[PDB]
């Protein structure tokens, strides 16, 4: 790594509370000073990277950081600053009060010790999450990028409950060819991957679109472990053969439909993130077109 237009003065960052015992480092919430030229102090999210991390995680960290530097979408966790000056390194992101979606969902489970006092997401709320994530994904693809790691565990939930994309360690550039092909050995999110990706190690927007579907399944099932009861080995075979997860109990027919779409075995039958957002535009909170990339002018 090497400094640039971000690298913020460490003396401007204060770590208040811890919000996640990562293994590669951690995630703290804190307050900052003079980040947004116009505001004195602003509360942020701070993701650290252990000094003594993994030869592998490090890279996937900077990738995440870097890749973010070019994004600007209401639905894609905003990057604020970096700090390579002395271990541990920091990536200052906008604070997503309610944590990652997986955890947020897992906390809606009635059996939950850390329950928020409310029921699981309702059809409306889902459609909302669906479109926001979809949008964020749409934007991402537009800036020529394939995520490869879409999952509730990588989506963040803001204070007001807006869902956004927040982890980018596995993201790859596709401006060139519009796809990514895994070379050799590596670690991949098998349970979220599409048949072709499973089969040929090829990642496209459609594969992300497939994952999208899985994320819906995660939501509609409060983050169950996809293909639970199936061995990593068995899951490959099962999905490459044309298998897909089952609708959870009481699953909104309308979200089921969305999943049947995302799980089309033939990648070209799967919708686009935009076609999705479009398919929903009518039933969303009013503050959507103001912020949405879909309704933005940058979409043309």
């Amino acid at each position: 790594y090497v400094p640039d237009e971000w690298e913020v003065s460490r003396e401007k960052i204060t770590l208040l509370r811890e919000l996640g015992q990562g293994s590669f480092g951690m995630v703290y919430e804190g307050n900052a000073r003079d980040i947004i030229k116009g505001e004195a102090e602003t509360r942020v999210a701070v993701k650290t990277v252990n000094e003594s991390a993994s030869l592998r995680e490090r890279i996937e960290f900077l990738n995440e950081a870097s890749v973010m530097k070019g994004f600007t979408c209401h639905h894609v966790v905003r990057l604020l600053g970096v700090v390579s000056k002395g271990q541990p390194t920091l990536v200052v992101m906008e604070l997503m009060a309610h944590g990652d979606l997986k955890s947020y969902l897992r906390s809606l489970r009635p059996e939950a010790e850390n329950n928020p006092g409310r029921p699981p997401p309702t059809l409306q709320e889902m459609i909302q999450m669906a479109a926001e994530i979809a949008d964020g994904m749409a934007y991402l693809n537009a800036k020529k990028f394939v995520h490869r790691d879409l999952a509730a565990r990588n989506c963040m939930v803001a204070h007001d409950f807006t869902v956004k994309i927040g982890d980018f360690g596995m993201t790859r550039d596709i401006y060139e060819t519009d796809y990514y092909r895994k070379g050799g050995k590596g670690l991949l999110p098998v349970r979220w991957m599409a048949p072709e990706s499973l089969k040929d190690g090829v990642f496209t927007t459609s594969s992300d679109m497939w994952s999208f579907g899985v994320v819906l399944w995660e939501i509609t099932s409060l983050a169950e472990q996809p293909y639970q009861g199936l061995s990593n080995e068995q899951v490959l075979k099962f999905v490459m053969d044309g298998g897909y997860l089952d609708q959870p109990d009481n699953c909104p027919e309308r979200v089921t439909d969305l999943m049947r779409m995302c799980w089309q075995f033939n990648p070209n039958m799967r919708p686009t993130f935009l076609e999705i957002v479009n398919l929903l535009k009518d039933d969303l909170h009013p503050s959507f077109p103001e912020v949405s990339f879909f309704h933005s002018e940058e979409n043309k």
Binding site: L55, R58, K182, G183, G184, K185, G186
Partner: protein, 37 residues
């Protein structure tokens, strides 16, 4: 609860690495393999 899995695409057919000790090696290697670029 695990998330990532070790695989290998070098070769006609796909493959989720089956040997415990080999699969556990993938990690470090995917790392170096990237250093080179």
């Amino acid at each position: 609860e695990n998330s990532l899995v070790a695989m290998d695409f070098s070769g006609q057919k796909s493959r989720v690495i089956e040997n415990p000790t080999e699969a556990l090696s993938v990690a470090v290697e995917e790392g170096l393999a990237w250093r080179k670029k």
